[PDB]
Design an enzyme around this catalytic site. Sequence first.
Site, short mmCIF file in Angstrom:
data_model
loop_
_atom_site.label_atom_id
_atom_site.label_comp_id
_atom_site.label_asym_id
_atom_site.label_seq_id
_atom_site.Cartn_x
_atom_site.Cartn_y
_atom_site.Cartn_z
N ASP A 1 -1.48 5.48 -5.30
CA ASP A 1 -2.01 4.67 -4.19
C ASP A 1 -2.33 3.25 -4.64
O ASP A 1 -3.42 2.97 -5.12
CB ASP A 1 -3.27 5.35 -3.61
CG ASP A 1 -3.83 4.62 -2.38
OD1 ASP A 1 -3.31 3.54 -2.03
OD2 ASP A 1 -4.77 5.15 -1.75
N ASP B 1 0.82 -1.23 0.00
CA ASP B 1 0.00 0.00 0.00
C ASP B 1 0.85 1.27 0.00
O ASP B 1 1.35 1.69 1.04
CB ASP B 1 -0.95 0.00 1.22
CG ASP B 1 -1.92 1.17 1.21
OD1 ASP B 1 -2.07 1.81 0.14
OD2 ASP B 1 -2.53 1.43 2.25
C1 LIG Z 1 -8.41 -3.01 -2.15
C2 LIG Z 1 -9.86 -3.07 -1.64
C3 LIG Z 1 -10.65 -1.82 -2.10
C4 LIG Z 1 -11.76 -1.81 -3.04
N1 LIG Z 1 -12.12 -0.47 -3.16
C5 LIG Z 1 -11.34 0.39 -2.27
C6 LIG Z 1 -11.36 1.83 -1.97
C7 LIG Z 1 -10.41 2.39 -1.06
C8 LIG Z 1 -9.49 1.52 -0.43
C9 LIG Z 1 -8.57 2.21 0.53
O1 LIG Z 1 -9.04 2.91 1.39
N2 LIG Z 1 -7.27 1.64 0.61
C10 LIG Z 1 -6.39 1.88 1.74
C11 LIG Z 1 -5.68 0.51 2.00
C12 LIG Z 1 -6.70 -0.66 2.06
C13 LIG Z 1 -7.94 -0.54 2.83
C14 LIG Z 1 -8.85 -1.66 2.87
C15 LIG Z 1 -8.51 -2.88 2.14
C16 LIG Z 1 -7.29 -3.00 1.37
C17 LIG Z 1 -6.37 -1.88 1.34
C18 LIG Z 1 -5.37 2.96 1.31
O2 LIG Z 1 -4.39 3.09 2.35
C19 LIG Z 1 -6.06 4.34 1.16
N3 LIG Z 1 -5.00 5.35 0.84
C20 LIG Z 1 -5.41 6.75 1.15
C21 LIG Z 1 -5.82 6.93 2.63
C22 LIG Z 1 -7.18 7.33 2.98
C23 LIG Z 1 -7.54 7.51 4.38
C24 LIG Z 1 -6.55 7.30 5.43
C25 LIG Z 1 -5.21 6.89 5.07
C26 LIG Z 1 -4.15 6.65 6.14
F1 LIG Z 1 -3.00 7.32 5.86
F2 LIG Z 1 -3.85 5.34 6.17
F3 LIG Z 1 -4.59 7.05 7.35
C27 LIG Z 1 -4.83 6.72 3.68
C28 LIG Z 1 -9.44 0.07 -0.68
C29 LIG Z 1 -10.41 -0.48 -1.64
N4 LIG Z 1 -12.33 2.63 -2.74
C30 LIG Z 1 -13.40 3.23 -1.93
S1 LIG Z 1 -12.49 2.45 -4.28
O3 LIG Z 1 -13.04 3.73 -4.81
O4 LIG Z 1 -11.21 2.15 -4.89
C31 LIG Z 1 -13.56 1.06 -4.86
C32 LIG Z 1 -13.32 -0.23 -4.05
#
Ligand SMILES: CCc1cn2c3c(cc(C(=O)N[C@@H](Cc4ccccc4)[C@H](O)CNCc4cccc(C(F)(F)F)c4)cc13)N(C)S(=O)(=O)CC2
Length: 374
Positions: free
Chosen positions: A217, A32
Site C-alpha cells: 500500500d 495509491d
Molecule cells: C499519506 C498520509 C498518511 C499518513 N498516515 C496515514 C495512514 C493511512 C493512510 C491511508 O488511509 N491511505 C489511503 C490513501 C490516502 C488517504 C489520505 C491521504 C493520502 C493517501 C490508502 O488508500 C489506504 N489503503 C487501504 C484502505 C483502507 C480503507 C479503505 C480503502 C478503500 F479501498 F479505498 F476503500 C483502502 C494515509 C496516511 N495511517 C493511519 S498511518 O498508520 O500510516 C500514519 C500516518
Amino acid sequence: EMVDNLRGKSGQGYYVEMTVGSPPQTLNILVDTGSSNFAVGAAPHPFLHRYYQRQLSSTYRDLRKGVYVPYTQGKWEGELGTDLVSIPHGPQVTVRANIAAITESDKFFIQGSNWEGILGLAYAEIARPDDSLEPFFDSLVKQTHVPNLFSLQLCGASVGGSMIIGGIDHSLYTGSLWYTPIRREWYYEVIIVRVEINGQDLKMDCKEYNYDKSIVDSGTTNLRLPKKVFEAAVKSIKAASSTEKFPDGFWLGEQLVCWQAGTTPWNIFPVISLYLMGEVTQQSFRITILPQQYLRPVEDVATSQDDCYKFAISQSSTGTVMGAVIMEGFYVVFDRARKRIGFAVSACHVHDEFRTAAVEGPFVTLDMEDCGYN
Ligand SMILES: CCc1cn2c3c(cc(C(=O)N[C@@H](Cc4ccccc4)[C@H](O)CNCc4cccc(C(F)(F)F)c4)cc13)N(C)S(=O)(=O)CC2
C-alpha cells in the site's frame, strides 16, 4: 523519460503529474496501490492549490451518481463522471477514465502537500460505489497497448521516485527480483510467513501476520501490524534498543524522539525481516527493513538543532499494511499480468556503513501450514 516522475513530502505520499479534461488541466496525483478510485479535488479547499474544473472540459461526462470513500486516514465525497486523462511523464497515451470529482472532504487533503487527487491502482473489487466502476489502470490497459504491469521505486522533507508504467527498468534495481503471489485481486494482497527482529523469530502462528489480510500500500505511510503482532514487535524492538529508554508515547507514534544533529544511534535499533510467501511450496524470501526506514524523519526548522523521528510502525485492526516506509529503497513490481509482486533492492536503497536493506532467498520451512487467514 519515466525515471524520477514522482515527488512528495516525507509522510505525505508520492505523486505523479497527470492531466484531466480537454483542454488538459494539470494536477498532481498521489499514487495509491491501496485503493481503486481515481479522484481529484473539484472544488475549492483551503489546502488545494488548484482543482479540476469540470465546466471547462468539453469531454467531461457526468455519470449522475455520487460516491463516498473513507480511507484509514481521511474521507471524501464526490460526483462520478468520465473524462480524458494523460500522464505527461508516463506512456504517451490519452485514456477516457472514471473520475470522482471531490466536492467535500474531511482530513483527506494535507496542508502544503502539493497533491490535489489520488490514483487508486488496485483492483475493481474494492472500487466504490462498487466493482462496476472500472479503475484507471484497467482502462489504460484496455484502451492502449500498455502491458498489464507497473513498478514503483519510492525513495527516502522532499522525496522523489519513479513509477514505471507497463514495464521494468533495470537501472532502478540491483540483484534479483523475488516474487510473491498476489493472493486475491482486490487490494494487492500478499502473505507474510515469518517475522524476525534482530534475527529473532517473533514465534507466532503465521496466520497472525495476515489477520485478516496483508497488503502492499503506497498510499499508507507506516508499516501497520495486527495488534498481537504489533505488541510483540514493539516488545522486541524495545529490548533491542534498551540501552536507551523512550516515553511510551514514542512507541504509540504520539511523540517524536530527537537527538543532537548527526548523532542518531542507528546501531541500537534492530533490523526487521519480513518473509513473504514464495512462488514455490513452503519457500519464501525476506525483505529486511533498517531503522532508517521505520524511524521516519520529521522535518521542522524549529527542531533543527536536532534530528527528530516518528516511529512509523503502528497498530491496525484491518490487517498488515506494508506502507511507504517498507516500500522505500525497494523496487516493487506490480505484475498484474502474472498475479505477483516482485521485490528487489533499489538504486536508492537504504544503508549505512554497517547494514543494508536486502531482498534475499530462498528460505524453506518444514511447517505445512497455510499462512493465509481466510
Ligand atoms: C499519506 C498520509 C498518511 C499518513 N498516515 C496515514 C495512514 C493511512 C493512510 C491511508 O488511509 N491511505 C489511503 C490513501 C490516502 C488517504 C489520505 C491521504 C493520502 C493517501 C490508502 O488508500 C489506504 N489503503 C487501504 C484502505 C483502507 C480503507 C479503505 C480503502 C478503500 F479501498 F479505498 F476503500 C483502502 C494515509 C496516511 N495511517 C493511519 S498511518 O498508520 O500510516 C500514519 C500516518
